[PDB]
Design a protein around this nucleic acid. Structure first.
Length: 72
RNA sequence: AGCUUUGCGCAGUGGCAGUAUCGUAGCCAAUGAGGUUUAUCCGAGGCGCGAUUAUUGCUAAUACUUUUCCCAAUAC
């Protein structure tokens, strides 16, 4: 259903991002700055300093291709 | 036929700051740089290296003596 999008980022990540976007057609009309935020959770900070790694991160950030880099 | 807007040049008159200005046959960048806030939101340069009075040129301040003239009879 999506060869290239699966090639870039696995299979679970692509499935989750189009499921949250609403299909390939709905995801195509979306800019990159919003695809970067597919799956961003509110992540209430309990004393900490927005060091929660999910202030503006979604399924793309937690994909293994991005997670296999130094944290900075 | 004046009035007026935008961008770009050439100037003139000012004001402001020298912890900043410039370079980039180096790299990356609207096929997306960078994202601290307004993130299903914003939207351009950034990094490394190099020059330097933290841009670069001038102008001025830090001294007076060479010469070149000389003595003599109305006499054995």
């Amino acid at each position: 259903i999506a060869p290239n999008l699966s090639i870039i980022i696995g299979a679970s990540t692509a499935a989750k991002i189009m499921g949250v976007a609403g299909g390939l057609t709905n995801l195509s009309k979306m800019p990159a700055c919003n695809i970067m935020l597919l799956g961003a959770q509110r992540k209430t900070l309990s004393g900490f300093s927005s060091t929660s790694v999910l202030p503006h991160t979604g399924y793309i950030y937690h994909s293994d291709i991005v997670q296999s880099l130094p944290p900075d």
